[PDB]
Design an enzyme around this catalytic site. Structure first.
Site, PDB file in Angstrom:
ATOM      1  N   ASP A 179       0.795  -1.224   0.000  1.00  0.00           N
ATOM      2  CA  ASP A 179       0.000   0.000   0.000  1.00  0.00           C
ATOM      3  C   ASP A 179       0.825   1.271   0.000  1.00  0.00           C
ATOM      4  O   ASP A 179       0.309   2.337   0.347  1.00  0.00           O
ATOM      5  CB  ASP A 179      -0.922   0.013   1.215  1.00  0.00           C
ATOM      6  CG  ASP A 179      -1.892  -1.129   1.207  1.00  0.00           C
ATOM      7  OD1 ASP A 179      -2.507  -1.365   0.152  1.00  0.00           O
ATOM      8  OD2 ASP A 179      -2.058  -1.801   2.242  1.00  0.00           O
ATOM      9  N   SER A 204       1.924   6.789   0.860  1.00  0.00           N
ATOM     10  CA  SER A 204       1.024   5.845   1.553  1.00  0.00           C
ATOM     11  C   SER A 204      -0.290   5.894   0.793  1.00  0.00           C
ATOM     12  O   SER A 204      -0.975   6.907   0.900  1.00  0.00           O
ATOM     13  CB  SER A 204       0.823   6.226   2.964  1.00  0.00           C
ATOM     14  OG  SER A 204      -0.190   5.425   3.548  1.00  0.00           O
ATOM     15  N   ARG A 205      -0.635   4.836   0.074  1.00  0.00           N
ATOM     16  CA  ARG A 205      -1.851   4.885  -0.769  1.00  0.00           C
ATOM     17  C   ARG A 205      -3.082   5.045   0.122  1.00  0.00           C
ATOM     18  O   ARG A 205      -4.084   5.585  -0.349  1.00  0.00           O
ATOM     19  CB  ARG A 205      -1.936   3.699  -1.728  1.00  0.00           C
ATOM     20  CG  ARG A 205      -0.698   3.457  -2.580  1.00  0.00           C
ATOM     21  CD  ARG A 205      -1.087   2.730  -3.854  1.00  0.00           C
ATOM     22  NE  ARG A 205      -0.220   1.622  -4.226  1.00  0.00           N
ATOM     23  CZ  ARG A 205       1.057   1.745  -4.554  1.00  0.00           C
ATOM     24  NH1 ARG A 205       1.630   2.931  -4.540  1.00  0.00           N
ATOM     25  NH2 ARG A 205       1.762   0.677  -4.882  1.00  0.00           N
ATOM     26  N   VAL A 206      -3.030   4.518   1.337  1.00  0.00           N
ATOM     27  CA  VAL A 206      -4.187   4.609   2.264  1.00  0.00           C
ATOM     28  C   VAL A 206      -4.430   6.083   2.522  1.00  0.00           C
ATOM     29  O   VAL A 206      -5.590   6.503   2.480  1.00  0.00           O
ATOM     30  CB  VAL A 206      -3.850   3.901   3.576  1.00  0.00           C
ATOM     31  CG1 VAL A 206      -4.583   4.514   4.755  1.00  0.00           C
ATOM     32  CG2 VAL A 206      -4.118   2.410   3.464  1.00  0.00           C
TER      33      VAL A 206
END
Ligand SMILES: Nc1ncnc2c1ncn2[C@@H]1O[C@H](COP(=O)(O)OP(=O)(O)OP(=O)(O)O)[C@@H](O)[C@H]1O
Ligand SMILES: Nc1ncnc2c1ncn2[C@@H]1O[C@H](COP(=O)(O)OP(=O)(O)O)[C@@H](O)[C@H]1O
Ligand SMILES: [Mg+2]
Lengths: 342, 52, 57, 353, 52, 86, 117
Positions: A179, A204-206
Site C-alpha cells: 500500500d 502511503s496509498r491509504v
C-alpha cells in the site's frame, strides 16, 4: 546499512504500550544480529509483547522459504479474534533467493533475473493476508463469542535493493503488492540525515485516513514542500538566481530537514510530534539558527513537560484539533519563543 | 552639553556593566535548570535499568 | 543502447572530464597573470587624477 | 575431527559484544573489530597485505593468548612458498597453522580447504582461546562452489552462479562467531569482479562483513605505513551504543578533518596557500599531524625500518587523537608524530628532532 | 566622551554574551558526565544483582 | 579473467597505441609484474626506477598537452622529459 | 484518433507543437547536463523556458486525489485546454513563472496563481 531494521524495531517498541501485538520474522539473518535484536527488545521491555520467528543464514533453504508463511499464520490468530497485530518480515529478498534455490534445484525454467514466475505468487499470497476485517467476519469466525470488534494485521515488509535501484525485478514486484513504500536513501544517511526518508518516492496509498485529525491537519503539504525543496536545491547548486522567496523557501526546507532527523530508540508521542509540527509551520523557527534547532526542540519538549502537561495528556488521549487547542498551542509557542532560551 | 554628555556617557557605562551581569545571572539560572533536569533524567533512567 | 556502445560513451565522457579539469587549472593561472597586469594599470590613472584634481579643484 | 558441522546454536552465542584490541592505531580507531566479527581487506597486492597479516598474527599471539589459522584457498604455489619463508624468517611461524589449496588441484580440493581451516579454528576456540582465521580469497571459495555445482549439472542462477550461492556462504560465515567459551575472528581478502559491487559474489559477501579495511597505493607512496585509507575504511562497530561516545566523537572528528583537508588540498592545488584563512591553515596543520600519527612501526617491519615495533593500547590512541584534534601539541612539528608510537613518544621524539 | 565609553561598555556586553555560552557549555558537559555516572552505577548494580 | 587470476602479471598491448605508432604497444600502469625488481639485474634495477615515475607523470600531464602548456613551466619540463622517454 | 480529419487542424497542430517543443527540450538535456544552461543559444533558452512551462501545465488536480493532495479537483474542457497550450506556444504567457502552471485546471487559474506568486 540504511536503518531498515532500526526503523522496524522502533515501530515494534512504540507498540509496547499501544495494545497492538507484534511479530518479528528474521529470514536469513545472522544469528549474532538476531540475538542482539532480541536483547535490545528485552532491554526496552517490548519483548513481552512480541513473537520472534527465526531462520538463520545457516539453515536449509526450505526453512527460510517457509519462515514468513509460518509467521503469517501466527499473526492471523489475533486478526481473527478481533485484536490488532503488527508483523515485520526482515528480508523478503532473502526469501525469494531461497525459493529460487529450491525452484532451480527442481529444474523449473527460470525467468527474469532467474527467478521463477511463481515469485510474484509467492509474495502476493503472503502479503495479501495482512488485512483488516469487518465485525461480521469476526462474529462468524468466532461463532459469536466476540461481537462488534474488528481485527487487523499490519505488515511492514523489508526489501534490500542494490545501489538504490528501485527498478529491479523483486523490488518492483513488492512495490506492486503493498500500500506504499518508505524509501531510505544512502546519500541522506551518509549525510547524517537519519532516518533517511526520501520524499517524492515514499507514499502511503491509504492516505491521511491513517492519521489522527491533529496530525492530518498539522502535516498537510509538508511532504511535497520537502520534495520541492530538494529539487530547488538541485538547481540552486547549479546557478545563482536568488529571488528572496527562494531564499526563504531554502531556509524553511533546511530547518524542516534539520527538525525531522531524530535519534534511534528515542520515540516521541503524538503530543510531542504535534507541537514540533506546529512550531515548524506556524513559523516560530524564524530567528532560530540551524545549529540551534535541536536545542530549541529539546528545551521546548521540556518546557511543555514541566508546565502545560495537562494539554499533553489531552492531545495524547484524543488526537483532536480544535481552535481551543490551537489557541493553547499558540500561547505555549508564543511564551516559549519570547520567555525561554535554548 | 559637556556636563550632560559626561554624565550620559557615565550613565551608559553604568548600564552595560549592569546588563552584562543580568545576562550572566540568567545564564547561571539556565545552567541550574539544565543540571537539575540532568539529575531528574539520571534518576528516571536508573529506574528502567533495574527492572531490566 | 548496448553495453559495447555504453562503454564507448563512458570512455568519451571520461576523456571530456580530464580536459575540463585541465582547463580549470589553466584558468586559475591566467586569472593570476591578468590581475598582476591589473595592478600595474592603477598608478598611471591615480597620478593623472591627482594632476586633474590639482587643476580642476 | 570431521570438517563438517553446524554453527553454534542460539543459546551458545555470547550474550555480549566485545571488541578486539588489534594494537594498530588506524584499525583500532577507524575500523574497530568486533570480537568474532568478519573483516574484509579490500586492497590489491603491492600494499602490505601480508605484513599486516603477519602483524596481526604476532599481536594476537603475544599480547593475547590466541593462535591463528591461515587458509590459502586457491593460492599460487609460488606465493604459498614465499609466504612460508617470510613467516619462518620472522618467528611468527610457530603461532600459525597453514592449510594450502594450490590452484593446480581439482575444484573439490579448493572448496573444502576453506572448511579445513575453519574446523582447526573451531578446535582452538573449544580450548577457550580467541582465534584469528585468515582466508586468502573468499572470491575463490565462491568460484570453487560454482565450478563444482556446474560439474554436478545443477541449473545456474543469477549471473551464472550456483543456485546455492547464499547458502554456501552462510554455511561458512555463520560458524565464525563468538561463543560463550571463546571466539573466532576472521580477516578475509575480497576481490570484486569487474569492479562491480552489485555482482552477486560481492553482494552476498557484504551481508556478512562487519568491518572493511581499504589499503591504498597512494598512502604507501606517501611512505605512511600501514597503508590503510581512513576515509574508505569503515566499521559498523562505530556507534556510541557499542563503542561509546568518546571513541565515536574522536573517529568522527579525524574523519571530518581529513575530508576537509582533501578539499583544501584541491584549493591549494589550483590557487596556492594564499587563499587559506587562519582557520584553514590550522585545519591543514592538524590534518598533517593526524596523517603522520596514523603511521606505526611493526615488530614485523624491524627488518626494514630498524626501529623497535610498538603495540598501542586503545586508550593511548584515543588520548593521542583527542590531543591533536583539539590543538594541544600544535607547538611541536609534524615529523615528531611520524612512525613514532604513542603520543607521549611523539613529544619525546620531538625534543631532539 | 561617549567614544571610549561606548566602545568599552559595548565590548563587555559582547564578552558577557560569549561567557553566557561558556556557562551553558559547562552545564551540558557536566550533564553528560552526570549521565555517565548514573548509567555506570545502574549497570554495576545490575551486574551485582545478576551475580548474586 | 581466468588467466589473469592464474599468472604473475601481464604485458597489456593496446591497439590505439599501435595506431599512434607506439610500437611495441605496451600500456604502462595497466601492465605490471608482481615479481618486480627481484628479476632485474642491478644496473637495470637502478636505472628503471625513474622511468616508471616519469611515464606516470607524463600520463597526468598528457591532458595539458594538446591544449597548450604555455601557462606552466616546471610541468613543461616534466612534460618534455615524459614525451622524450615515451 | 489524432488526425486532422477526426479532431480538426487546430487540435492536431497544437498537439504536434507540444511534441515538437518537448522533443527539442530532450535534445538539449545532455549539453545542459554537462555544461549547464548558460552555454545555450539565446532562443534555445526560450525553448527550455516554454518546454518547462508546458511540462507543468500538463499537470492537473484530480477529484480522487483529494485524499492525497488535499487540493480541490478540476475538470477541463477540450476547447479550454487547446486554447491554453496554443497561448503558451505563442508566448502570450511567457512572463509568468513556472510554479504558476503547476496543478492548475485552466490557464486563467495560472495567471490567478501567478498573482498569488
Ligand atoms: N536514528 C539513527 N541515527 C543514527 N544512526 C542510526 C539511526 N538508526 C540507525 N542508525 C545506525 O544505522 C546503522 C545500521 O542500522 P541497521 O542495521 O538497522 O540498518 P539496516 O539498513 O537495517 O542494516 P542491514 O541492512 O544490515 O540490516 C547502525 O550503525 C545504526 O546505529
Ligand atoms: N610497515 C612497513 N614498513 C616498511 N615497508 C613496508 C611496510 N608495510 C609494507 N611495506 C612494503 O610494502 C611492499 C609490499 O608489501 P607486501 O606485503 O609484499 O604486499 P603484497 O604481499 O600484497 O605484495 C613491500 O616493499 C613492503 O616492504
Ligand atoms: Mg537491517
Amino acid at each position: 546499512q540504511t536503518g531498515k531494521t532500526a526503523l522496524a524495531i522502533d515501530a515494534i517498541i512504540n507498540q509496547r504500550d499501544s495494545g497492538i501485538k507484534a511479530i518479528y520474522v528474521a529470514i536469513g539473518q545472522k544469528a549474532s544480529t538476531i540475538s542482539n535484536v532480541v536483547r535490545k527488545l528485552e532491554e526496552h521491555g517490548a519483548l513481552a509483547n512480541t513473537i520472534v520467528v527465526v531462520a538463520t543464514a545457516s539453515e536449509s533453504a526450505a526453512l527460510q522459504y517457509l519462515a514468513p508463511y509460518a509467521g503469517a499464520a501466527m499473526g492471523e490468530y489475533f486478526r481473527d479474534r478481533g485484536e490488532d497485530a503488527l508483523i515485520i518480515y526482515d528480508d523478503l529478498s532473502k526469501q525469494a533467493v531461497a525459493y529460487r534455490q529450491i525452484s532451480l534445484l527442481l529444474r523449473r525454467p527460470p525467468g527474469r533475473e532467474a527467478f521463477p514466475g511463481d515469485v510474484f505468487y509467492l509474495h502476493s499470497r503472503l502479503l495479501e493476508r495482512a488485512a483488516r476485517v469487518n465485525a461480521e467476519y469476526v462474529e462468524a469466525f468466532t461463532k459469536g463469542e466476540v461481537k462488534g470488534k474488528t481485527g487487523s494485521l499490519t505488515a511492514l515488509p523489508i526489501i534490500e535493493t542494490q545501489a538504490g535501484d528501485v527498478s529491479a525485478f523483486v523490488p518492483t514486484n513488492v512495490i506492486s503488492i503493498t500500500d506504499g513504500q518508505i524509501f531510505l536513501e544512502t546519500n541522506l544517511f551518509n549525510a547524517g540525515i537519519r532516518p533517511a526518508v526520501n520524499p517524492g518516492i515514499s507514499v502511503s496509498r491509504v492516505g491521511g485516513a491513517a492519521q489522527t485529525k491533529i496530525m492530518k491537519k498539522l502535516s498537510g503539504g509538508i511532504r511535497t514542500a520537502l520534495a520541492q525543496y530538494r529539487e530547488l536545491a538541485a538547481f540552486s547548486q547549479f546557478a545563482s538566481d536568488l529571488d528572496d522567496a527562494t531564499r526563504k523557501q531554502l531556509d524553511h526546507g533546511q530547518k524542516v530537514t534539520e527538525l525531522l532527523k531524530q535519534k534511534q530508540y528515542a520515540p516521541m508521542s503524538v503530543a510531542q510530534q504535534s507541537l514540533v509540527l506546529f512550531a515548524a509551520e506556524r513559523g516560530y523557527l524564524a530567528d532560530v539558527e540551524l545549529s540551534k534547532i535541536g536545542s530549541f526542540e529539546a528545551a521546548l519538549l521540556a518546557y511543555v513537560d514541566r508546565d502545560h502537561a495537562p494539554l499533553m495528556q489531552e492531545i495524547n488521549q484524543t488526537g483532536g484539533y480544535n481552535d481551543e487547542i490551537e489557541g493553547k498551542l499558540k500561547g505555549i509557542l508564543d511564551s516559549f519563543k519570547a520567555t525561554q532560551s535554548w | 552639553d559637556l556636563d550632560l554628555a559626561k554624565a550620559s556617557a557615565t550613565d551608559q557605562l553604568k548600564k552595560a556593566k549592569a546588563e552584562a551581569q543580568v545576562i550572566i545571572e540568567q545564564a547561571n539560572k539556565r545552567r541550574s535548570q539544565i543540571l537539575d533536569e540532568a539529575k531528574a533524567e539520571a534518576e528516571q533512567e536508573r529506574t528502567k535499568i533495574v527492572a531490566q | 543502447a548496448g553495453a559495447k556502445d555504453i562503454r564507448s560513451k563512458i570512455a568519451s565522457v571520461q576523456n571530456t572530464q580530464k580536459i575540463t579539469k585541465a582547463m580549470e587549472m589553466v584558468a586559475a593561472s591566467k586569472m593570476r597573470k591578468s590581475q598582476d597586469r591589473m595592478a600595474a594599470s592603477r598608478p598611471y590613472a591615480e597620478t593623472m587624477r591627482k594632476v586633474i584634481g590639482h587643476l580642476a579643484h | 575431527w570431521a570438517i563438517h558441522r553446524a554453527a553454534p546454536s542460539y543459546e551458545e552465542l555470547s550474550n555480549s559484544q566485545e571488541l578486539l584490541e588489534t594494537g594498530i592505531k588506524v584499525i583500532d580507531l577507524m575500523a574497530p573489530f568486533a570480537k568474532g566479527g568478519k573483516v574484509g581487506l579490500f586492497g590489491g597486492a603491492g600494499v602490505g597485505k601480508t605484513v599486516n597479516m603477519m602483524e596481526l598474527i604476532r599481536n594476537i599471539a603475544i599480547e593475547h593468548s590466541g593462535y591463528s589459522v591461515f587458509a590459502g584457498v586457491g593460492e599460487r604455489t609460488r606465493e604459498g612458498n614465499d609466504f612460508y619463508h617470510e613467516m619462518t624468517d620472522s618467528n611468527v611461524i610457530d603461532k600459525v597453522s597453514l592449510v594450502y589449496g594450490q590452484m593446480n588441484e581439482p575444484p573439490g580440493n579448493r572448496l573444502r580447504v576453506a572448511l579445513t581451516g575453519l574446523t582447526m579454528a573451531e578446535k582452538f576456540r573449544d580450548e577457550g582461546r580467541d582465534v584469528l582465521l585468515f582466508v586468502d580469497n573468499i572470491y575463490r571459495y565462491t568460484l570453487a562452489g560454482t565450478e563444482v555445482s556446474a560439474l554436478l549439472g545443477r541449473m545456474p542462477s543469477a549471473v551464472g552462479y550456483q543456485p546455492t550461492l547464499a547458502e554456501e556462504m552462510g554455511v561458512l560465515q555463520e560458524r565464525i562467531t563468538s561463543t560463550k567459551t571463546g571466539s573466532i575472528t576472521s580477516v578475509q581478502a575480497v576481490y570484486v569482479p569487474a569492479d562491480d559491487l552489485t555482482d552477486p559474489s560481492p553482494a552476498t559477501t557484504f551481508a556478512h562483513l562487519d568491518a572493511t579495511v581499504v589499503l591504498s597505493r597512494q598512502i604507501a607512496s606517501l611512505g605512511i605505513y600501514p597503508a590503510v585509507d581512513p576515509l574508505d575504511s569503515t566499521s559498523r562497530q562505530l556507534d556510541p551504543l557499542v563503542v561509546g561516545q568518546e571513541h565515536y566523537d574522536t573517529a568522527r572528528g579525524v574523519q571530518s578533518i581529513l575530508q576537509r583537508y582533501q578539499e583544501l588540498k584541491d584549493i591549494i592545488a589550483i590557487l596556492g596557500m594564499d587563499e587559506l584563512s587562519e582557520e584553514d591553515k590550522l585545519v591543514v596543520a592538524r590534518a598533517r599531524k593526524i596523517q603522520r600519527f596514523l603511521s606505526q612501526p611493526f615488530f614485523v617491519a624491524e627488518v626494514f625500518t630498524g626501529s623497535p615495533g610498538k603495540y598501542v593500547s586503545l586508550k593511548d590512541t584515543i588520548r593521542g587523537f583527542k590531543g591533536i584534534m583539539e590543538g594541544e601539541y600544535d607547538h611541536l612539528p609534524e615529523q615528531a608524530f611520524y612512525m613514532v608510537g604513542s603520543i607521549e613518544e611523539a613529544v619525546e621524539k620531538a625534543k631532539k628532532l
